[PDB]
Amino acid sequence: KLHKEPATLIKAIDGDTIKLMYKGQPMTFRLLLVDTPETKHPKKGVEKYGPEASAFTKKMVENAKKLEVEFDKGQRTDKYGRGLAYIYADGKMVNEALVRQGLAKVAYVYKPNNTHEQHLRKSEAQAKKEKLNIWS
Known part of the structure; x- marks a missing residue:
């Protein structure tokens, strides 16, 4: 069984990367099971929907009263x-x-x-059906 622990935002870096204070230390977290278009690509630098994915993650985490991190069952x-x-x-x-x-x-x-893989794939299938953003 997975469980949630508290963390505090230090800085949103990208659509899928965040710096958080976790068990008292600054640590960089990468979001499991998702790929967002990058604004910090080795090669291309800034890709399409990159700044939008990035602003969406930032607003979501900056405006939250409570952030929690949940590790999966494999490597952390x-x-x-x-x-x-x-x-x-x-x-x-x-x-x-x-x-x-x-x-x-x-x-x-x-x-x-891959604990939340099915649930994520169901949401992806809905965004494709609705033709949103990446899927338009």
């Missing part, structure tokens, strides 16, 4: 030292919110970190 850090988590703003999953608005695709999934 990627090879860059970023935490791999589902982030919740006032009880609403930010990973899902993005996918539901057509501002993120469901990523390539690495078992065992």
